[PDB]
Design an enzyme around this catalytic site. Structure first.
Site, PDB file in Angstrom:
ATOM      1  N   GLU A   1       0.190   0.846   3.349  1.00  0.00           N
ATOM      2  CA  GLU A   1       0.354  -0.534   2.899  1.00  0.00           C
ATOM      3  C   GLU A   1      -0.854  -0.998   2.095  1.00  0.00           C
ATOM      4  OE1 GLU A   1       0.549   0.481   6.017  1.00  0.00           O
ATOM      5  OE2 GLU A   1       2.433  -0.153   6.953  1.00  0.00           O
TER       6      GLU A   1
ATOM      7  N   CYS B   1       0.789  -2.120  10.960  1.00  0.00           N
ATOM      8  CA  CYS B   1      -0.116  -2.465  12.042  1.00  0.00           C
ATOM      9  C   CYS B   1      -0.579  -3.916  11.893  1.00  0.00           C
ATOM     10  CB  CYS B   1      -1.311  -1.510  12.053  1.00  0.00           C
ATOM     11  SG  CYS B   1      -2.575  -1.857  10.827  1.00  0.00           S
TER      12      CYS B   1
HETATM   13 ZN   LIG Z   1      -1.776  -0.521   9.081  1.00  0.00          ZN
END
Ligand SMILES: [Zn+2]
Length: 174
Positions: A52, A81
């Site tokens: 990401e 996360c």
């Molecule tokens: Zn992450």
């Protein structure tokens, strides 16, 4: 530096929404991007700095421009996360011209609160947090995998895993 496509063996090893695939540390991110200045298009694959953050660095440093709108869709092997979710929600908060949809194959590794709060924060900022269904896996197999024109063979239990993960995500985001 995003690659155009991945190997089918890698795709099956990382995008399985089964139980074993929760031991997979790697995280992959397919993306499709519609650039509307009124229009161009991009798509590709990132891998894990998580995937990401890699997309955010590449996209921000190489693509972004004001007076330009962006329709971005992510296909992630893992749900983001809490740190990545905070950075993405922060980014979207500061870039209203960017609309993001996140479709994930797997949710968090364990039943942590800060992961749920990461997803909810992503949703509060306007990002669509969703579970990958059979159509999403097939689309990724067509557009991000060297499928060699072989048809997509789904793994055993894909749809029930979807129903479980989607009930969980409904409980998280409600
Ligand atoms: Zn992450």
């Amino acid at each position: 530096n995003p690659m155009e496509a991945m190997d089918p063996h890698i795709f099956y090893f990382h995008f399985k929404n089964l139980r074993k695939a929760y031991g997979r540390n790697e995280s992959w991110l397919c993306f499709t991007m519609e650039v509307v200045k009124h229009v161009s298009w991009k798509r590709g694959v990132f891998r894990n700095r998580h995937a990401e953050r890699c997309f955010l660095s590449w996209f921000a440093d190489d693509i972004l421009s004001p007076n330009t709108n962006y329709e971005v869709t992510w296909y992630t092997s893992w749900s983001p996360c809490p740190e990545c979710a905070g950075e993405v929600a922060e980014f979207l908060a500061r870039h209203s011209n960017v609309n993001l949809t996140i479709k994930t194959a797997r949710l968090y590794y364990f039943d942590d609160t800060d992961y749920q709060e990461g997803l909810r924060s992503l949703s509060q900022e306007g990002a669509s947090v969703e579970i990958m269904g059979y159509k999403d896996f097939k689309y990724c197999w067509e557009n991000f995998v060297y499928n060699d024109d072989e048809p997509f063979k789904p793994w055993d239990g894909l749809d029930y895993n979807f129903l479980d993960l989607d009930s969980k995500l409904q409980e998280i985001l409600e």
